[PDB]
């Protein structure tokens, strides 16, 4: 084996928070190494809507500002990574949970094209809304396997996933 010192790490380095307006990987979202191409908007009255799955994780707060439960509807991959992050958030800050401020968007809040229109993007905070935490939250989102993570706003981190 590689030797002692490459076992279970007793004193791991702290992971690095991302900086305001940083994105990882450091390429455009729609590029192949990140979240790949936009396949087009999903409407409620389509059949790609039926591929979207609802996320009912009790450890995740859904703002659901629209009161439609649309924020819960996402692709399986988006659900998988979001569920992984919900675990790591609680581990990092006890008593704190992951919060989704926007998921699948039916209302065109995101320019002409957006991964929010196809259940492949969430905007997130900590449940305590302590904005000093968000650099680290965005780091946790990277390590949880989101395919692109962008510290878009002082108010949220935007995370997205590849299609399927
Ligand atoms: Zn977003």
Swiss-Prot record:
Changing residue 91 to K: In HPE3; familial; in the mouse sequence shows no change in activities at different temperatures. N-palmitoylation by HHAT of ShhN is required for sonic hedgehog protein N-product multimerization and full activity. It is a prerequisite for the membrane-proximal positioning and the subsequent shedding of this N-terminal peptide. Changing residue 93 to R: In HPE3; the same mutation in the mouse sequence causes a failure of Shh processing leading to retention of the immature glycosylated protein within the endoplasmic reticulum of transfected cells; causes a temperature-dependent conformational change that allows Shh to bind Ptch1 at 4 or 32 degrees Celsius but not at 37 degrees Celsius; drastically reduces signaling potency in chicken embryo neural plate explant assays. It is a lipid-anchor. Ca(2+) 2 binds at residues 66, 102, 105, 107. Zn(2+) binds at residues 116, 123, 158. It is found in: Cell membrane. A motif (Cardin-Weintraub) lies at residues 8-14. Ca(2+) 1 binds at residues 65-66, 71, 101-102. Multimer. Binds calcium and zinc ions; this stabilizes the protein fold and is essential for protein-protein interactions mediated by this domain. The Cardin-Weintraub (CW) motif is required for heparan sulfate binding of the solubilized ShhNp. The N-terminal palmitoylated peptide is cleaved at the heparan sulfate-binding Cardin-Weintraub (CW) motif site. The cleavage reduced the interactions with heparan sulfate. The cleavage is enhanced by SCUBE2. The dually lipidated sonic hedgehog protein N-product (ShhNp) is a morphogen which is essential for a variety of patterning events during development. Induces ventral cell fate in the neural tube and somites. Involved in the patterning of the anterior-posterior axis of the developing limb bud. Essential for axon guidance. Binds to the patched (PTCH1) receptor, which functions in association with smoothened (SMO), to activate the transcription of target genes. In the absence of SHH, PTCH1 represses the constitutive signaling activity of SMO. This is Sonic hedgehog protein N-product. The gene is SHH. The chain holds residues 25 to 188 of 462 of the full protein.
């Amino acid at each position: 084996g590689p030797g002692r010192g490459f076992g279970k790490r007793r004193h791991p380095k702290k992971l690095t928070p991302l900086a305001y307006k940083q994105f990882i990987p450091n390429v455009a979202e729609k590029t192949l190494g990140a979240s790949g191409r936009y396949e087009g908007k999903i409407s409620r009255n389509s059949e790609r809507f039926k591929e979207l799955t609802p996320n009912y994780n009790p450890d995740i707060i859904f703002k659901d500002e629209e009161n439609t439960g649309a924020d819960r509807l996402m692709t399986q991959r988006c659900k998988d990574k979001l569920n992984a992050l919900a675990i790591s958030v609680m581990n990092q800050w006890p008593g704190v949970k992951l919060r989704v401020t926007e998921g699948w968007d039916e209302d065109g809040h995101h320019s002409e094209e957006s991964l929010h229109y196809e259940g492949r993007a969430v905007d997130i905070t900590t449940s305590d809304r302590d904005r000093s935490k968000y650099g680290m939250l965005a780091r946790l989102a990277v390590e949880a396997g989101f395919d692109w993570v962008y510290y878009e706003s002082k108010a949220h981190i935007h995370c997205s996933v590849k299609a399927e």
